[PDB]
Amino acid sequence: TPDLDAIVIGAGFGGIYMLHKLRNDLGLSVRVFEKGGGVGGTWYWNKYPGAKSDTEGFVYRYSFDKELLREYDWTTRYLDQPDVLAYLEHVVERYDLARDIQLNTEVTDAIFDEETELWRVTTAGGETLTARFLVTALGLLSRSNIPDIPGRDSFAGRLVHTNAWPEDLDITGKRVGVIGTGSTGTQFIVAAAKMAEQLTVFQRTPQYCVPSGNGPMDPDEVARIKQNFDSIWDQVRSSTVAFGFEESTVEAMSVSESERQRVFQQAWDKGNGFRFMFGTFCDIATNPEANAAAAAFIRSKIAEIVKDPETARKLTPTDLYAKRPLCNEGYYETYNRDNVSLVSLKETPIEEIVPQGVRTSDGVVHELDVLVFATGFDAVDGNYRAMNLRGRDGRHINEHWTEGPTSYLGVTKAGFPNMFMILGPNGPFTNLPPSIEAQVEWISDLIDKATREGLTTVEPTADAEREWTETCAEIANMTLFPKADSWIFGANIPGKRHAVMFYLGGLGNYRRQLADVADGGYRGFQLRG
Ligand SMILES: Cc1cc2nc3c(=O)[nH]c(=O)nc-3n(C[C@H](O)[C@H](O)[C@H](O)COP(=O)(O)OP(=O)(O)OC[C@H]3O[C@@H](n4cnc5c(N)ncnc54)[C@H](O)[C@@H]3O)c2cc1C
Ligand SMILES: NC(=O)c1ccc[n+]([C@@H]2O[C@H](COP(=O)([O-])OP(=O)(O)OC[C@H]3O[C@@H](n4cnc5c(N)ncnc54)[C@H](OP(=O)(O)O)[C@@H]3O)[C@@H](O)[C@H]2O)c1
Ligand SMILES: NC(=O)c1cccnc1
């Protein structure tokens, strides 16, 4: 007899909803463990200036409760971190969740016992306890990547990763350096340049960026959106990226050059990087010729905006427009400020971090008070591999993942009975809340089935999981995403395996996959009782 029906790890969007479903809707005994000192996940940790979601606010939220959709107000097109955090706090209040969320608690081990058919969880604080079902909502973008740059530990000032940004830290009037120019570093840059006495940007690889179009909302527009939520969410759930805009069905090279220009400009004007990539034409991320047009458009904007021609050159990407799409308020314009300098690490790599700052290969010591690592994440599988997570035959998850991380349907793992993952390997790449909902609800139904039928284990087969990997690989290979150097395929971490880590078929497709497996008697699962 287990201590609990279920244990959930993580208190972001994922664990919050999971706990609600299992405890409030199914009546099970449940506890969440979260390592942070507060709920919110990404939106607890990422306290840096500029931190925000690029999903527009109207759809960066749960959809499952109509009353909450009616009552909760937003006032800006995009939601800054504090605002997302406040929403998730409200959710925890609303559904009386906080009493079952144990904070400051890192789970260091999770071990299946094949004899008792129970999971045993161990905390960093030295406690253990058992559950029949384990749900890991550990975050695709949660384990910080802090590179081993020589002399890093010598720096005498405040050295922080963005995913560990300290609430107390005020960079106003300080000399700040930032390493990294992905989505995090670019939004930080915009914000920080307005506060810092000097900002130095240490850029290894320039990225493409479009306007966000952020600003206040018209409150009458928010009321209209609320009145139309049913339609809005139907379109989200059937779409590929789930960002709340209608995706193009037009091939880029099927129209005239003037019409391409017009379409790109319209999207540029409206804002949002996912809109640029998927709201313009249907084939920007699959057809090299279409990709080249989109990339050219953005390069032309850089050249218009950035006054200094060497700065413009250093900011102009040369690679495929196939990284996670960026958007920002006035990113390239920030380089026109007198208090911002751009160091290309291709020209002058970092030689050593020193007590006073960063020394680049030209011998220049960049003197800093604050050094910010916007260096991204050990994405998707990082928190799984770092756990002592063991399944049948006492095998660690790493033994299953030697050619990259794997799952069946994003949510389960062969050899790991009664373990469910929220946003595990080889799941959807979308606006994440509605993907999380699809997964949570599917997991809930399957756990309920086990409860009603008296099942003791639920597990995918090895064959099912291998087929899923092949599905994901084949879809990925139909796109340009494998051909961009970034975290999506593992390439960002030295030594990490380059592998597919997402199902790239989209939300509507993904939802059908889940529904078809369930409706087909849980095709691919051993159900034992
Ligand atoms: C700065 C930033 C901007 C983002 N912008 C967007 C956006 O525009 N659109 C979009 O859809 N998504 C965006 N995301 C992705 C975002 O992570 C997800 O939308 C969503 O917040 C994920 O929720 P989650 O619950 O799956 O994971 P997370 O919010 O990552 O939560 C996982 C939690 O698990 C905890 N945890 C992990 N391992 C352990 C353990 N071993 N023991 C205990 N606790 C543990 C972590 O501390 C964390 O709180 C962004 C991410 C970042 C970092
Ligand atoms: N606006 C939002 O919606 C938003 C905001 C933040 C995060 N996110 C999400 O989180 C994901 C990750 O974004 P991120 O910006 O945190 O990480 P990222 O995309 O992985 O970017 C990391 C940055 O650090 C650089 N870097 C890494 N290691 C380095 C090293 N050893 N030396 C120098 N530079 C190094 C990378 O350069 P290279 O390119 O040369 O490797 C890159 O510029 C996004 O793609 C998005 O999915 C979203
Ligand atoms: N928008 C993002 O940040 C995101 C991250 C991971 C997967 N899908 C979307």
XYZ file of C-alpha atoms and ligand atoms in Angstrom:
639
model
C 0.000 0.000 0.000
C 1.671 3.271 -1.115
C 1.993 6.438 0.983
C 0.219 8.380 -1.835
C -1.691 7.509 -4.999
C 0.504 9.845 -6.972
C 3.568 12.079 -6.703
C 4.052 14.997 -9.058
C 7.497 16.664 -9.476
C 7.474 20.329 -10.492
C 5.113 23.216 -9.829
C 5.071 25.071 -13.127
C 2.117 25.058 -15.542
C 2.512 21.344 -15.817
C 2.581 20.150 -12.189
C 0.020 22.668 -11.090
C -2.600 21.312 -13.532
C -1.605 17.722 -12.931
C -2.179 18.103 -9.185
C -5.537 19.700 -9.804
C -6.692 16.897 -12.036
C -5.498 14.017 -9.817
C -6.544 15.487 -6.506
C -9.587 17.637 -7.203
C -11.093 15.846 -10.165
C -10.108 12.174 -9.450
C -10.071 12.351 -5.636
C -6.649 10.719 -5.373
C -4.043 11.439 -2.645
C -1.306 13.507 -4.232
C 1.731 15.621 -3.385
C 3.850 17.871 -5.542
C 7.541 18.368 -4.844
C 9.096 21.533 -6.208
C 12.741 22.521 -5.624
C 11.976 26.248 -5.774
C 10.864 28.386 -2.890
C 7.653 29.259 -4.795
C 5.369 27.900 -7.452
C 5.504 28.968 -11.073
C 8.311 27.120 -12.725
C 9.873 29.137 -15.478
C 7.926 32.154 -14.181
C 9.304 31.765 -10.600
C 12.937 31.378 -11.677
C 13.298 33.851 -14.578
C 13.221 37.068 -12.636
C 15.527 38.991 -14.942
C 14.629 42.405 -16.458
C 12.789 41.880 -19.776
C 11.646 38.392 -19.011
C 8.369 37.698 -20.764
C 6.451 35.162 -22.821
C 6.225 35.507 -26.641
C 2.920 33.661 -26.708
C 0.508 36.566 -26.754
C -1.198 36.935 -23.529
C -4.624 35.971 -24.586
C -3.543 32.357 -25.094
C -0.632 32.093 -22.580
C -2.936 30.679 -19.968
C -5.018 27.635 -19.158
C -8.234 27.021 -21.136
C -9.869 24.280 -19.092
C -11.949 26.498 -16.780
C -14.393 28.863 -18.519
C -15.011 30.950 -15.416
C -11.340 31.663 -15.055
C -11.156 32.662 -18.679
C -14.048 35.066 -18.089
C -12.727 36.581 -14.907
C -8.962 36.932 -15.184
C -7.787 40.181 -16.815
C -4.662 41.012 -18.769
C -3.689 44.612 -19.838
C -0.647 44.103 -22.089
C -0.382 42.198 -25.325
C 2.432 40.046 -23.937
C 2.783 38.995 -20.301
C 5.896 39.876 -18.349
C 7.242 37.315 -15.868
C 5.617 38.908 -12.748
C 2.254 38.764 -14.517
C 2.545 35.085 -15.502
C 3.751 34.276 -11.964
C 0.765 36.105 -10.482
C -1.602 34.099 -12.688
C -0.145 30.764 -11.681
C -0.286 31.879 -7.998
C -3.886 32.681 -8.517
C -4.578 29.332 -10.036
C -2.937 27.637 -6.983
C -5.181 29.741 -4.678
C -8.327 29.181 -6.739
C -8.112 25.416 -6.694
C -6.732 25.152 -3.044
C -3.495 23.579 -4.271
C -0.873 25.088 -2.054
C -1.584 22.686 0.858
C -0.301 19.805 -1.356
C 2.707 21.511 -2.890
C 5.916 21.018 -0.865
C 8.375 23.707 -1.753
C 12.195 23.771 -1.390
C 12.106 20.033 -2.125
C 14.408 18.596 -4.798
C 13.712 15.000 -5.791
C 17.068 13.309 -6.131
C 15.966 9.689 -6.765
C 12.917 8.001 -8.187
C 13.072 4.244 -8.189
C 10.578 1.618 -9.356
C 10.175 -1.482 -7.227
C 9.084 -4.385 -9.450
C 8.066 -6.466 -6.490
C 5.605 -3.994 -4.942
C 4.962 -2.187 -8.257
C 5.421 1.153 -6.532
C 7.628 4.149 -7.016
C 9.925 5.340 -4.239
C 10.902 9.011 -4.266
C 13.825 10.410 -2.263
C 14.239 14.078 -1.370
C 17.462 16.080 -1.084
C 16.475 16.619 2.562
C 16.634 12.838 3.188
C 13.044 11.707 3.188
C 11.438 8.942 1.201
C 7.976 7.911 0.289
C 6.018 5.784 -2.080
C 3.302 6.300 -4.740
C 1.644 4.131 -7.356
C 1.941 6.806 -10.029
C 4.809 9.188 -10.737
C 4.328 12.323 -12.919
C 7.468 14.199 -13.819
C 6.778 17.822 -14.910
C 10.412 18.825 -14.803
C 10.446 21.429 -17.567
C 11.836 21.366 -21.069
C 13.623 24.694 -20.363
C 14.522 24.489 -16.682
C 18.002 23.014 -16.129
C 20.404 25.929 -16.458
C 23.459 25.572 -18.816
C 26.400 27.504 -17.326
C 29.414 26.927 -19.586
C 32.940 26.219 -18.280
C 34.557 29.322 -19.465
C 38.135 29.632 -18.171
C 38.418 31.736 -15.006
C 34.629 31.937 -14.480
C 34.972 31.290 -10.744
C 37.460 34.238 -10.386
C 34.920 36.890 -11.175
C 34.449 39.124 -8.107
C 31.128 40.760 -8.953
C 27.623 39.419 -9.301
C 27.672 36.414 -11.696
C 24.278 35.085 -12.503
C 22.437 32.845 -15.029
C 19.129 34.320 -16.130
C 17.260 31.224 -14.901
C 18.687 31.967 -11.432
C 18.306 35.723 -11.557
C 18.255 37.127 -7.941
C 15.278 39.216 -6.970
C 17.470 41.699 -5.070
C 19.771 42.498 -8.060
C 19.289 46.004 -9.478
C 21.525 46.662 -12.470
C 20.653 50.343 -12.625
C 23.859 52.389 -13.110
C 26.087 49.397 -13.226
C 28.560 48.008 -15.831
C 26.897 44.882 -17.125
C 28.042 42.134 -19.453
C 25.899 39.458 -20.998
C 26.906 36.266 -22.674
C 24.256 34.925 -25.055
C 21.894 36.346 -27.666
C 19.016 33.870 -27.850
C 15.484 34.710 -26.834
C 16.625 35.304 -23.207
C 19.673 37.360 -23.896
C 17.966 39.594 -26.529
C 14.937 40.514 -24.329
C 17.343 41.085 -21.385
C 19.481 43.321 -23.618
C 16.542 45.523 -24.535
C 15.599 45.987 -20.900
C 19.089 46.218 -19.505
C 20.328 48.853 -21.904
C 17.785 51.277 -20.414
C 19.100 50.706 -16.873
C 22.811 49.955 -17.054
C 25.511 52.622 -17.170
C 27.175 50.379 -19.828
C 26.099 47.133 -21.406
C 28.522 44.857 -23.147
C 27.087 42.081 -25.255
C 29.287 38.998 -25.846
C 27.662 37.479 -28.929
C 28.863 34.202 -30.377
C 26.095 33.784 -33.028
C 23.734 36.519 -34.208
C 20.083 35.580 -34.508
C 17.130 36.739 -36.607
C 14.542 38.808 -34.701
C 11.241 40.526 -35.592
C 9.153 43.128 -33.669
C 7.024 41.860 -30.905
C 4.438 44.598 -31.317
C 4.046 44.670 -27.545
C 1.986 47.388 -25.911
C -1.117 48.000 -23.845
C -4.292 46.171 -24.664
C -7.420 47.963 -25.480
C -9.792 46.785 -22.653
C -12.642 46.591 -25.193
C -10.513 44.184 -27.251
C -9.871 42.002 -24.153
C -13.677 41.908 -23.617
C -14.177 40.882 -27.240
C -11.524 38.218 -26.979
C -13.205 36.842 -23.849
C -16.549 36.708 -25.608
C -14.902 34.705 -28.426
C -12.775 32.345 -26.330
C -14.567 29.216 -27.366
C -13.641 29.797 -31.049
C -10.201 31.022 -30.163
C -9.342 27.862 -28.282
C -10.840 25.580 -30.946
C -8.523 27.222 -33.497
C -5.542 26.846 -31.032
C -6.125 23.181 -30.445
C -6.455 22.362 -34.181
C -3.511 24.404 -35.240
C 0.141 23.427 -35.614
C 1.930 25.982 -33.311
C -1.023 27.066 -31.150
C -0.061 30.706 -30.872
C -3.642 31.983 -31.496
C -3.169 33.232 -35.105
C -4.365 31.593 -38.310
C -1.470 29.828 -39.984
C -0.812 30.352 -43.667
C -1.708 27.792 -46.246
C 0.132 29.590 -49.028
C 3.524 28.517 -50.415
C 5.947 31.374 -50.419
C 7.236 30.908 -53.917
C 3.675 30.533 -55.393
C 3.095 34.303 -55.234
C 4.897 37.241 -56.738
C 7.977 38.879 -55.270
C 5.851 41.946 -54.488
C 3.260 39.859 -52.673
C 6.090 38.082 -50.576
C 7.346 41.497 -49.588
C 3.918 42.645 -48.678
C 3.139 39.540 -46.620
C 6.476 39.758 -44.711
C 5.990 43.429 -44.104
C 2.437 42.952 -42.836
C 3.717 40.281 -40.401
C 6.666 42.494 -39.371
C 4.214 45.305 -38.620
C 1.865 43.094 -36.627
C 4.773 41.480 -34.652
C 5.574 38.063 -33.156
C 8.202 35.632 -34.257
C 5.926 32.667 -34.595
C 3.611 34.857 -36.719
C 6.587 35.646 -38.992
C 7.597 32.098 -39.362
C 4.163 30.447 -39.692
C 1.623 33.233 -40.302
C 3.229 34.439 -43.551
C 3.608 31.353 -45.707
C 3.188 27.611 -45.052
C 6.719 26.547 -45.946
C 9.170 28.949 -44.341
C 10.564 26.165 -42.117
C 10.444 23.385 -44.779
C 11.408 24.903 -48.101
C 14.950 26.349 -48.449
C 13.853 28.828 -51.086
C 11.036 30.178 -48.861
C 13.410 30.217 -45.865
C 15.903 32.277 -47.828
C 13.254 34.939 -48.595
C 12.202 35.250 -45.002
C 15.836 35.465 -43.820
C 16.621 38.082 -46.468
C 13.758 40.239 -45.370
C 15.029 40.294 -41.775
C 18.630 41.001 -42.874
C 17.352 44.015 -44.865
C 15.714 45.376 -41.761
C 18.928 45.063 -39.774
C 20.764 46.990 -42.381
C 18.077 49.763 -42.303
C 17.937 50.006 -38.531
C 21.539 49.739 -37.293
C 23.465 52.971 -37.954
C 27.035 51.784 -37.611
C 27.922 49.492 -40.498
C 30.395 47.290 -38.500
C 27.758 46.825 -35.799
C 25.164 46.011 -38.494
C 27.520 43.430 -39.983
C 28.159 41.783 -36.612
C 24.411 41.601 -35.962
C 23.494 40.056 -39.363
C 22.912 36.325 -39.215
C 24.082 34.137 -42.049
C 22.545 30.844 -41.252
C 19.055 29.315 -41.786
C 15.996 30.951 -40.266
C 15.251 27.717 -38.375
C 15.981 28.437 -34.677
C 13.063 29.098 -32.296
C 11.836 32.420 -33.682
C 12.687 35.552 -31.724
C 10.797 38.799 -31.299
C 11.497 41.885 -29.158
C 10.748 45.590 -28.765
C 13.510 47.482 -30.598
C 16.261 44.828 -30.365
C 18.408 46.010 -33.247
C 17.717 49.639 -32.335
C 19.295 49.042 -28.897
C 22.655 48.845 -30.636
C 22.271 52.511 -31.681
C 22.564 53.572 -28.015
C 25.821 55.092 -26.829
C 25.905 52.787 -23.763
C 25.768 49.471 -25.595
C 28.732 47.648 -27.121
C 28.738 44.524 -29.139
C 31.651 42.063 -28.976
C 31.646 39.379 -31.555
C 33.142 36.222 -30.011
C 33.913 35.068 -33.497
C 36.325 37.924 -33.942
C 37.571 38.155 -30.310
C 36.608 35.061 -28.263
C 36.721 35.146 -24.503
C 40.192 34.155 -23.275
C 39.473 34.293 -19.535
C 37.023 35.604 -17.026
C 38.963 37.620 -14.364
C 38.106 39.202 -11.092
C 37.253 42.585 -12.700
C 35.443 41.261 -15.841
C 36.127 39.471 -19.109
C 39.300 39.392 -21.103
C 38.890 38.770 -24.805
C 41.524 37.501 -27.203
C 42.504 41.007 -28.217
C 43.714 41.532 -24.602
C 40.915 43.954 -23.786
C 39.636 43.719 -20.238
C 35.946 44.455 -20.164
C 35.343 45.770 -16.672
C 32.070 44.581 -15.197
C 30.055 44.793 -11.977
C 27.625 42.146 -13.194
C 28.151 39.244 -15.541
C 24.988 37.609 -16.905
C 24.943 34.168 -18.382
C 22.076 34.032 -20.914
C 23.482 30.710 -22.014
C 20.361 28.638 -22.179
C 19.434 25.204 -20.928
C 20.185 21.537 -20.837
C 16.887 21.274 -22.602
C 14.219 18.563 -22.599
C 16.094 15.742 -20.924
C 18.396 17.642 -18.558
C 16.423 17.207 -15.288
C 15.708 13.552 -16.082
C 19.357 12.582 -16.670
C 20.448 14.448 -13.489
C 17.993 12.467 -11.337
C 18.733 8.946 -10.103
C 15.733 7.729 -12.084
C 15.535 3.964 -12.391
C 12.993 1.565 -13.835
C 12.699 -2.104 -14.460
C 15.827 -4.190 -13.805
C 17.141 -1.230 -11.811
C 18.334 0.453 -14.988
C 18.986 4.194 -14.937
C 17.199 6.275 -17.618
C 20.547 7.063 -19.133
C 20.882 3.438 -20.203
C 17.726 3.854 -22.323
C 18.875 7.157 -23.848
C 22.282 6.438 -25.346
C 21.218 7.595 -28.846
C 19.166 10.533 -27.469
C 16.158 10.808 -25.198
C 13.053 8.750 -25.978
C 9.432 8.305 -25.015
C 6.158 6.902 -26.224
C 3.895 9.879 -27.189
C 5.981 12.402 -25.217
C 4.348 11.213 -22.011
C 5.431 7.642 -21.117
C 8.591 5.489 -21.245
C 9.144 1.820 -21.832
C 10.723 0.219 -18.775
C 9.213 2.834 -16.524
C 5.784 1.629 -15.572
C 3.303 4.067 -14.013
C 5.569 7.029 -14.834
C 4.068 9.894 -16.870
C 5.946 12.839 -18.224
C 4.630 16.408 -18.850
C 6.593 17.781 -21.722
C 8.944 14.852 -21.813
C 11.154 13.984 -24.783
C 9.601 13.676 -28.253
C 6.474 15.673 -27.642
C 4.972 18.809 -29.200
C 6.750 22.016 -30.002
C 3.957 24.638 -29.640
C 2.656 27.362 -27.392
C 3.076 25.096 -24.311
C 0.071 25.625 -22.064
C -2.376 23.916 -24.465
C 0.097 21.099 -25.074
C 0.425 20.677 -21.297
C -3.353 20.537 -21.085
C -3.602 17.864 -23.710
C -0.989 15.754 -21.915
C -2.346 16.292 -18.383
C -5.838 15.399 -19.437
C -4.736 12.286 -21.323
C -2.588 11.156 -18.321
C -5.483 11.813 -15.988
C -7.824 9.625 -18.078
C -5.319 6.776 -18.187
C -4.631 6.913 -14.415
C -8.371 6.927 -13.843
C -8.778 3.907 -16.035
C -6.100 2.129 -13.983
C -7.965 3.081 -10.795
C -11.450 2.007 -12.036
C -10.158 -1.302 -13.507
C -7.716 -2.203 -10.717
C -4.634 -2.125 -12.895
C -1.337 -2.362 -11.119
C 0.904 -1.290 -14.021
C 0.614 0.657 -17.218
C 3.671 0.664 -19.502
C 4.505 1.187 -23.194
C 6.231 -1.453 -25.113
C 9.793 -1.112 -26.358
C 8.453 -1.522 -29.936
C 5.886 1.259 -29.439
C 8.504 3.621 -28.117
C 10.970 2.806 -30.977
C 8.163 3.440 -33.541
C 7.508 6.803 -31.878
C 11.164 7.752 -32.145
C 11.116 6.831 -35.886
C 7.922 8.920 -36.370
C 9.548 11.879 -34.765
C 12.746 11.538 -36.688
C 10.936 11.247 -40.028
C 8.870 14.365 -39.371
C 11.877 16.352 -38.190
C 13.788 15.394 -41.306
C 10.969 16.980 -43.434
C 11.922 20.360 -41.916
C 14.891 22.657 -41.687
C 14.978 22.595 -37.871
C 17.717 19.885 -37.722
C 19.877 22.135 -39.783
C 20.114 24.961 -37.295
C 22.661 24.783 -34.503
C 20.719 25.196 -31.276
C 19.284 23.598 -28.314
C 16.346 21.899 -29.991
C 18.405 18.954 -31.082
C 20.877 18.949 -28.193
C 23.710 20.653 -29.931
C 24.120 23.469 -27.534
C 25.746 21.528 -24.727
C 29.287 20.147 -25.385
C 29.103 16.347 -25.351
C 25.336 16.209 -25.552
C 23.987 13.820 -28.179
C 22.589 15.476 -31.325
C 19.159 13.899 -31.608
C 15.474 14.551 -32.223
C 13.855 15.654 -28.992
C 10.425 16.839 -30.210
C 7.460 15.650 -32.263
C 7.316 18.434 -34.891
C 3.837 17.586 -36.267
C 1.955 20.229 -34.335
C -0.705 20.397 -31.678
C -3.711 19.314 -33.799
C -1.776 16.309 -35.107
C -0.420 15.514 -31.565
C -3.911 15.665 -30.025
C -5.136 13.178 -32.695
C -2.256 10.877 -31.879
C -3.180 10.798 -28.257
C -6.865 10.394 -28.918
C -6.322 7.618 -31.457
C -4.127 5.604 -28.996
C -6.647 5.934 -26.231
C -9.618 5.130 -28.404
C -7.754 2.075 -29.842
C -7.522 0.431 -26.339
C -4.246 2.145 -25.567
C -2.425 0.862 -28.494
C 1.204 0.274 -27.554
C 0.533 -0.222 -23.804
C 0.734 -3.272 -21.529
C -2.074 -2.916 -19.065
C -1.697 -5.415 -16.171
C -4.022 -6.160 -13.062
C 12.333 32.908 -20.270
C 11.420 31.909 -20.880
C 10.422 32.345 -21.799
C 9.468 31.465 -22.331
N 8.558 31.922 -23.334
C 7.647 30.980 -23.744
C 6.638 31.350 -24.783
O 6.778 32.473 -25.377
N 5.786 30.467 -25.109
C 5.713 29.217 -24.645
O 4.795 28.444 -24.906
N 6.667 28.782 -23.684
C 7.590 29.664 -23.414
N 8.600 29.196 -22.480
C 8.617 27.805 -22.075
C 7.953 27.652 -20.668
O 8.894 26.873 -19.862
C 6.682 26.866 -20.712
O 5.669 27.664 -21.483
C 6.000 26.531 -19.397
O 6.261 27.594 -18.472
C 6.569 25.214 -18.907
O 5.869 24.795 -17.737
P 6.298 23.355 -17.126
O 5.494 23.232 -15.876
O 6.299 22.286 -18.174
O 7.889 23.564 -16.766
P 8.652 24.584 -15.850
O 7.941 25.901 -15.750
O 9.971 24.601 -16.341
O 8.627 23.945 -14.385
C 9.387 22.723 -14.073
C 9.609 22.857 -12.547
O 10.169 21.562 -12.160
C 11.023 21.856 -11.062
N 11.903 20.706 -10.999
C 12.697 20.178 -11.946
N 13.391 19.078 -11.574
C 13.009 19.012 -10.242
C 13.359 17.973 -9.163
N 14.255 17.017 -9.517
N 12.786 18.139 -7.990
C 11.962 19.094 -7.742
N 11.518 20.071 -8.635
C 12.120 19.888 -9.799
C 11.691 23.129 -11.475
O 12.306 23.807 -10.358
C 10.549 23.951 -12.108
O 9.924 24.821 -11.210
C 9.575 30.084 -22.068
C 10.657 29.677 -21.216
C 11.563 30.550 -20.734
C 12.705 30.067 -19.854
N 10.771 35.639 -25.443
C 10.388 34.420 -25.082
O 9.414 33.876 -25.457
C 11.529 33.579 -24.531
C 12.513 34.128 -23.707
C 13.565 33.310 -23.221
C 13.588 32.041 -23.474
N 12.642 31.469 -24.303
C 12.650 30.046 -24.690
O 13.829 29.418 -24.132
C 14.687 28.983 -25.194
C 16.161 29.140 -24.841
O 16.486 30.516 -24.971
P 17.839 31.081 -24.334
O 18.099 32.408 -24.979
O 17.778 31.003 -22.845
O 18.928 30.019 -24.756
P 19.579 29.663 -26.211
O 18.601 29.865 -27.308
O 20.180 28.289 -26.053
O 20.709 30.734 -26.383
C 21.966 30.600 -25.654
C 22.842 31.686 -26.097
O 24.130 31.551 -25.371
C 25.162 31.420 -26.309
N 26.190 30.533 -25.677
C 25.987 29.267 -25.223
N 27.170 28.736 -24.738
C 28.102 29.676 -24.917
C 29.502 29.722 -24.691
N 30.194 28.707 -24.187
N 30.162 30.869 -25.015
C 29.497 31.911 -25.528
N 28.178 31.936 -25.819
C 27.482 30.841 -25.546
C 24.546 30.838 -27.557
O 25.432 31.080 -28.633
P 25.381 30.092 -29.949
O 24.098 30.410 -30.708
O 26.700 30.436 -30.669
O 25.389 28.709 -29.388
C 23.215 31.632 -27.571
O 23.456 32.973 -28.067
C 14.193 29.864 -26.418
O 14.698 29.385 -27.691
C 12.702 29.835 -26.207
O 12.192 28.550 -26.568
C 11.605 32.216 -24.762
N 8.038 29.191 -27.115
C 9.011 28.541 -26.470
O 9.688 29.038 -25.655
C 8.825 27.069 -26.641
C 9.782 26.349 -25.989
C 9.790 24.967 -26.121
C 8.851 24.329 -26.943
N 7.880 25.065 -27.561
C 7.902 26.432 -27.409
